[PDB]
């Protein structure tokens, strides 16, 4: 029993069809159980969505090994991505909350208390000692725990362990536990990357794909300079051509990725950006491709 959990599903997207010959649920299932044999630090769990799974591994990188090996085998899949359920139920997120310090080494007391305190991580108690370290149990929920393991290992530098579980089904409170900064740049339809299209709004942050890179709707193609999200477009790149006439001028270029990693893009998500992976590629789209469709689920108060 280690930790971590990466929900699994089926690339029931539009792009067909597609990776190799194993993208449906059946083929996937056969793989899941096949792993529940050799793997010792793996913990496959069943969620609600027939196309979702709570892959509970050990380390943040651990889950990567299985994912990286999946592609080379020929099977595209998104990440993580099994969310939780807000119950129960009248109601407002009654999940649990369990924190655990990670000595310390007073060289992280202010580097770990920030994230926790910034994410509601209520320090139910910081059991200190005469040695030098000091525990820190922050009743955190499954909503503010995800990805935490990663950044955490980057704060204490390995030397920092702490799990959790739950203390009582809450209601999620009233604030969002991220939600990530710098909104993600989404597409407005399938086609291809157009130099004249990606040139315009290029200083509004960073880009992912290139050209003629022809992605689709919902698929992210860079991050926004702010937190807000948008759905630009271009191919088009337009427009050709002549005459007349000539000769000057101008010849905009463009920078490339910025690409990778996985491993460097997965943790990039937050709400619902299934990192659709393939046995030779790795994409990342939102739980709701169509823009207007996203607004359907949000829909906020009250």
């Amino acid at each position: 029993e280690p930790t971590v959990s990466m929900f699994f599903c089926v690339n029931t997207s539009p792009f067909c069809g597609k990776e190799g010959k194993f993208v449906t649920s059946r083929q996937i299932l056969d793989r899941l159980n096949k792993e529940l044999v050799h793997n010792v630090a793996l913990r496959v769990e069943e969620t609600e969505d027939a196309d979702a799974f709570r892959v509970s591994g050990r380390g943040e990188l651990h889950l990567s090994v299985l994912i990286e090996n999946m592609r080379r085998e020929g099977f595209e899949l998104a990440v993580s991505r099994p969310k939780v359920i807000f119950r129960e139920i009248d109601g407002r997120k009654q999940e649990p909350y369990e924190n655990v310090t990670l000595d310390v080494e007073e060289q992280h007391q202010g580097s770990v208390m920030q994230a926790l305190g910034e994410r509601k991580g209520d320090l139910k108690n910081m059991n200190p000692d005469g040695k030098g370290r000091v525990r820190l149990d922050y009743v955190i929920p499954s909503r503010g725990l995800i990805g935490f393991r990663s950044e955490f290992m980057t704060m204490t530098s390995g030397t920092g362990l702490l799990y959790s579980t739950f203390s009582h089904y809450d209601d999620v409170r009233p604030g969002e536990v991220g939600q990530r900064q710098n909104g993600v740049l989404i597409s407005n339809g399938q086609g291809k990357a157009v130099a004249f299209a990606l040139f315009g709004l290029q200083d509004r942050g960073k880009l992912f794909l290139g050209h003629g890179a022809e992605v689709y709707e919902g698929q992210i193609i860079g991050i926004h300079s702010r937190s807000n999200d948008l759905t630009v477009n271009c191919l088009t790149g337009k427009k050709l051509t002549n005459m007349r006439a000539s000769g000057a001028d101008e010849a905009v270029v463009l920078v490339p990725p910025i690409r990778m990693t996985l491993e460097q893009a997965l943790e990039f998500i937050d709400d619902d950006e299934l990192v659709e992976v393939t046995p030779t590629s790795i994409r990342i789209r939102k739980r709701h491709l169509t823009e207007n469709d996203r607004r359907r689920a949000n829909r906020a108060p009250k």
Binding site: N125, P128, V134
Partner: protein, 134 residues
């Protein structure tokens, strides 16, 4: 070894959460949950800045005894400062009786820098100002 640190808890409660406390129980002290012992002490002291305040011996221990309320706080402690319930002020429950300030200390004027034969006239004017009684 030996060397303790300064600290200021509350005057009434005893529950030792974050005050008694990553402070004492770390830099230098012993045991925790100083709350249970705090209530059996601060109970008779806590409502005008009471410093003691927070240390740690070779036990550690413990509650009992105390200091009192800081100057101003102890000078206008007989007010209510019930305000502050929003922003810096500022309506309802403000005054505390012109004589009260004096009657409240009065006694509440023993432990202080050098000495003071009055903490309700000159002492109040100061502390009181910090609260709202200017």
């Amino acid at each position: 070894v030996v060397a303790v640190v300064k600290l200021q808890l509350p005057a009434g409660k005893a529950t030792p959460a974050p005050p008694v406390g990553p402070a004492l129980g770390q830099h230098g002290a012993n045991i925790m949950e100083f709350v249970k012992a705090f209530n059996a002490a601060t109970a008779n002291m806590g409502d005008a800045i009471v410093p003691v305040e927070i240390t740690i011996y070779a036990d550690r221990s413990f509650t009992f005894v105390t200091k009192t309320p800081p100057a101003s706080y102890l000078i206008r402690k007989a007010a209510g400062l019930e305000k502050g319930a929003h922003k810096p002020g500022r309506e309802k429950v403000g005054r505390i009786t012109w004589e009260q300030v004096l009657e409240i200390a009065k006694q509440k004027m023993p432990d202080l820098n050098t000495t003071d034969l009055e903490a309700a006239a000159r002492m109040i004017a100061g502390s009181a100002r910090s609260m709202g009684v200017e």
